[PDB]
Design a binder for this molecule. Structure first.
Ligand code: SPH
Ligand code: SPH
Ligand code: MYR
Ligand code: MYR
Lengths: 5, 56, 268, 60, 283, 283, 60, 136, 268, 5
């Protein structure tokens, strides 16, 4: 879905 | 580059007293100097150098 | 210390200035008192003081003199020797009143084959004797105050005999410490000795000392620095050896009261 | 498979972000993230066997 | 966990000093650089440092495309003493100087290669006769695959070699290449030979170039105009731009100080004086 | 929390008055402007105000690309007394006047720069001979990097300088630049010099221009036609458009009232009468 | 990483919205949001040391 | 009108005497030895913008029936936190007669204007030997 | 340490060999990496390695050279300088592949009345420039590999003009570090300085460095040792002073793969 | 995922 760094 | 607005000032070295040697000793000698950046030092805006070229 | 720390190796930093030494003989704090600002309970002029902090409390190096077999000794007065030193001198001449402590660092290196010993004395109120035997207390302001060049001691008293136009200067005889007392006793004043086999410098930290909390720096000198050869310079078999002596001095905790226009003294 | 990271905002007009999606199987095709690490200079500036304490004599 | 865009350390305020601590005295014989900061030798104020080293990270330092070669091709009728011109280039970063100098701040490197191709054409002769839009074939020929002898021979079929068919006047072509080295890193310097000269062997037989490892390190690019020829002549140039993406580097080196003179570290007589006159006590 | 697109204050209904409250009387000597609204001096009705100041926010006021320069290049054969023309431009907003005047409503600014490049070409001589589609290289040369002396010399390799290879007839090129000032803001006015004239120094040696700070503030754009030359001559122009995005401004100033006369605030004799005749009691 | 904001709808045919995604790492590459703030003119229109009450005599 | 940005350091910096405005632009025509000074025309605020708009800068008016002084408290303003005071001036003080002096029916009235200015919160960095500028 | 331990006094022991020194300036570990054997996760040749341990990882002393007022500098390559050293050399020429780290100890004592300073640099891949301006990359194997005698630097580039029978050797100019880069920057390579007033030796511990885990020791040199006079030799007022320089080097953690018959190289 | 202003 989504990775958030 | 050399720029008057962003000039950095002057490094100089002087004799405080004098070099003193005893007899049987060289009266002249060399000092060597080194420069390096501190941990608060940074650079920016990447550019090509003038220290290398390729004529033809 | 097992991490290398030595009594002989010091670094001093005041303002934008650092002194290093690798051959010290510890350092002295006169009368055990470190310099301080004037406390409210001892204050006297009521106006807000000026405290120039790093602008004036930094190491100033005076003109280097030369030590030879014929040297009888040198003297300086504080604050007089610093009167033309950067913003300290400026702050001094703009105000009626000023007080200051000092770190005095005398420098003189040589070699393991030279020998000699300088007694370096800091004397509170170092009043020196005049050249006249027809008049007393007549040394002029100009001659009393040499500025950074300082003055010198002599081995001989020689009276000024020109009565028409008197020299009006000091005639400070070395074994009489320039003041009629014996030099061998000058060690009761805060001091160090530069004995060339042992050390290449002397460091004296001087408090402001006076019978007042603050005073006229231009009229009055609080401390005198007297440097005399206790054991004469000698090297190998040279008839005429020479080594330099340099004074670097820093004002400490100086404050000034009574701001007005600048003083322009008659110095010559 | 979207990757969301923050920009270090320089001149201004909360965190501003940007989105990245890899379109290819080979990591070689990917753009550079510029999310890089720093390290201490020591292996070049202090390569000595015995740790240096800067207030101490370097030679003892 | 410290990142390239993190701010550098704050200057901490510091006062007067009089102690046995000697930061300023040191000994460069040890091989170490004295780690000093301004508060070690002067009085400082507290400063909150905002500056970062983001643009000088290895990636950011190299994150630019650099020209590494110019290939010339034409679209002319092949005739008994001269054929239609196709170009052949041995892949390298050492034909030009700027990227070479930057890479050579280091001994070894690893990176993915981004190649961008800028293509330009022109008429060479006066006739008002025209040409139609050219398609170019950029074939990568890895060491071992057959090199084209003619603009139209069988090798341009490319069943296995990667080729780019570029259309003139469209966006510059671009492909990526993984780290393809046969070693664990690319060697910018190889102090050695590819052959050991044996005594029981002739000198000729044991001989090889100093500092060269695989003869055809990375292979060839062969470029041609795919179009048949026009009555009028058109010459084209393919400028190749190399960018090292996802890069790592090891063992720093002093930069090239005198002009490059070939693929090795050799230098030419007459080029050995980089420094200019300046008096010791003149600012 | 009030935003640029919020509606302005409603007019509140207000009736007759007879008091010691004196809104209308004031004193401009104080340096203040009297904050009056219509209900302070006349009778008003209630109005629900829908209008907003959205289009006059600093961002909206500047949110347009403006032409700042026109660069001329050609693609001609270099011959002993004249070479192929490439262009060099020192980046500035002061070569044209409209964006300059808008920026100069303020003393200092911060912004990200958007540069758009419109490229146009034409034939200059009568021959019916043609040219093929041109590619242009727009190289940014920051202060210190080597400026090109020839259309084809080594500096056009660009290993570190940013370059744009623009293809003729495609969409106008565009890049963004961060706030790159060496100060915390760009100075639209610098009341000073870059050198102090010292007494112990000659006048020549201490001299510098009034109001100039760094000589090469932002560097250069160098533009060339990458193509080799055609038999026929083609001239091109690169029009540069500057838009300040993400902008902040400080210290407002009266706008330029007389024609610009150079990069400073100087004015020319003959241009100093902006105002026209109009009689005091004539509407 | 999508940012959803509302349009101020002028001529009409609920809140109409628009979507924004940043495609680049550098905030300088971003478009302008136009989501700007206003401020009071006072620092230029009433720069006086003692607060002005408009119904009162400006000089007292 | 043959050169721009050429006012010398000496003429740019009058020290305490300041300079004056003029009602007329008059170009320096000595090209051999140029005057190298400002020619600041009053209705153009000495800088090519109209004086009537100078009120967007912080100001007060000394209108003799109302007040006998102006007091402006100025912050340090610059595009930098600190700068060369010797190379660069941060603020300019411009005083112009918006309505001319007049008294009774005297043809030649005169009244004095005095400036008293105090530095506030000043700090200095980069101590060395004193600067000795070429001022004449 | 309060039990006497000093940065200047060291003992190194490898195999049946010990080095002592009483005037060191600490010691250097190149890039902070101590030598190691090849790990399984980085291994490449699959055959059981040979690890000669104390038989080869011991101190070998090379031929002593002489430092004079006219010395421009000396260089050596590793493993080449050790190719004829006991069982290390044997193990090297019997195997296709080999890797090794090193302790390099440069020795040079004088007296408190001598002065001079040697920069001792360990350079990974120390490629040196050739003598020709008609050809590049043409230094022969024999001339590239001097064995223990090493080579020298020169202050002058002098091109080989015999085109019939080219010298095919290096012409390594000292201020260009023999490779076209400025000597003043050689300090970014792991180094120490032998400054005669301070120390009488340099000690560099070198890891195996390469773009491969293991390689042909006979075809390829991993490290170069360059020794250059940063400040020239001088003593009393002698016109022609001389002091010796000795190199003792020990392989560390060396392992070999690909055993066959011994290599017999063409060295002359 | 989504920001909503
Ligand atoms: C259709 C286009 C395909 C292009 C394919 C190119 C594949 C070859 C990549 C070559 C890698 C070159 C790396 C640079 C040089 C080396 O670092 C050094 N000279 C030492 O190994
Ligand atoms: C490939 C194209 C790259 C273009 C790069 C341009 C970088 C330089 C940006 C210049 C910034 C100019 C700002 C405007 C002027 C200044 O505000 C004032 N004259 C005072 O500082
Ligand atoms: C993770 O990626 C899940 C969300 C998918 C978001 C939309 C992807 C946009 C189009 C990508 C096409 C695929 C590229 C090969
Ligand atoms: C946050 O963005 C998560 C949702 C992703 C939505 C689809 C993104 C559309 C394609 C963006 C490609 C990346 C641009 C560099």
């Amino acid at each position: 879905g989504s990775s958030s760094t | 580059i050399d720029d008057s607005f962003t000039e950095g000032g002057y490094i100089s070295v002087f004799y405080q007293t004098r070099i003193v040697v005893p007899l049987s000793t060289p009266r002249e000698m060399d000092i060597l100097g080194f420069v390096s950046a501190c941990n608060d030092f940074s650079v920016r805006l990447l550019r090509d150098t003038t220290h290398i070229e390729q004529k033809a | 210390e097992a991490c290398g720390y030595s009594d002989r190796v010091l670094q001093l930093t005041l303002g934008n200035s650092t002194i290093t030494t690798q051959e010290a003989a510890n350092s002295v704090v006169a009368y055990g008192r470190w310099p301080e600002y004037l406390r409210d309970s001892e204050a006297n002029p009521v106006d807000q003081p000026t405290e120039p902090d790093v602008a004036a409390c930094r190491f100033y190096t005076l003109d280097t003199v030369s030590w030879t077999k014929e040297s009888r000794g040198w003297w300086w007065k504080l604050p007089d020797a610093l009167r033309d030193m950067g913003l300290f001198g400026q702050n001094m001449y703009y105000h009626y009143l000023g007080r200051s402590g000092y770190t005095v660092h005398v420098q003189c290196n040589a070699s393991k084959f030279h020998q000699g010993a300088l007694g370096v004395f800091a004397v509170p109120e170092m009043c020196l004797a005049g050249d006249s035997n027809t008049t007393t207390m007549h040394t002029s302001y100009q001659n009393a105050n040499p500025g950074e060049k300082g003055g010198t001691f002599t081995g001989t008293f020689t009276p000024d005999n020109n009565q028409t136009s008197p020299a009006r200067r000091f005639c400070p005889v070395d074994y009489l410490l320039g003041n009629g007392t014996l030099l061998g006793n000058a060690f009761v004043f805060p001091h160090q000795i530069i004995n060339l086999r042992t050390n290449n410098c002397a460091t004296l930290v001087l408090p402001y000392v006076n019978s007042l909390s603050i005073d006229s720096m231009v009229k009055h000198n609080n401390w005198g620095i007297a440097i005399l050869p206790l054991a004469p310079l000698n090297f190998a078999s040279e008839s005429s050896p020479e080594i330099p002596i340099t004074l670097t001095i820093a004002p400490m905790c100086c404050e000034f009261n009574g701001l007005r226009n600048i003083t322009l003294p008659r110095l010559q | 498979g979207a990757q969301v990271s923050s920009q270090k905002v320089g001149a201004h007009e909360s965190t501003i972000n940007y989105t990245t999606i890899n379109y290819y199987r080979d990591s070689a095709s990917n753009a550079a993230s510029k999310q890089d690490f720093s390290q201490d200079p020591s292996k070049f500036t202090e390569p000595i066997k015995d740790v240096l304490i800067k207030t101490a004599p370097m030679l003892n | 966990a410290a990142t390239s865009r993190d701010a550098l350390p704050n200057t901490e305020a510091s006062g007067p000093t009089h102690s046995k601590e000697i930061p300023a005295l040191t000994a460069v014989e040890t091989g170490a650089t004295n780690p000093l900061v301004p508060s070690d030798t002067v009085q400082t104020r507290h400063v909150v440092q905002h500056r970062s080293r983001s643009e000088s990270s290895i990636e950011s330092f190299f994150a630019r495309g650099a020209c590494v070669t110019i290939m010339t091709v034409d679209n002319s009728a092949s005739t008994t003493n001269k054929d239609k011109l196709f170009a052949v280039w041995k892949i390298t970063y050492k034909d030009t100087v700027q990227l070479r100098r930057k890479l050579e701040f280091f001994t070894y490197s690893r990176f993915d290669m981004e190649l961008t191709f800028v293509v330009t054409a022109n008429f060479t002769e006066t006739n008002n006769g025209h040409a139609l839009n050219q398609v170019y074939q950029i074939m990568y020929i890895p060491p071992g695959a057959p090199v084209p002898e003619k603009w139209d021979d069988y090798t341009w079929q490319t069943s296995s070699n990667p080729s780019i068919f570029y259309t003139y006047g469209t966006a510059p072509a671009r492909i990526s290449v993984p780290y393809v080295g046969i070693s664990n890193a690319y060697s910018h310097f190889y102090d050695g030979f590819s052959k050991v000269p044996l005594k029981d062997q002739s000198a000729a037989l044991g001989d090889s170039l100093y500092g060269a490892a695989s003869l055809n390190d990375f292979g060839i690019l062969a470029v041609r105009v795919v179009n048949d020829h026009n009555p009028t002549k058109v010459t084209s140039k393919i400028r190749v731009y190399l960018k090292p993406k996802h890069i790592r580097v090891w063992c720093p080196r002093p930069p090239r100080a005198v002009a490059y003179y070939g693929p090795g570290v050799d230098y030419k007589d007459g080029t050995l004086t980089p420094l200019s006159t300046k008096d010791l006590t003149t600012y």
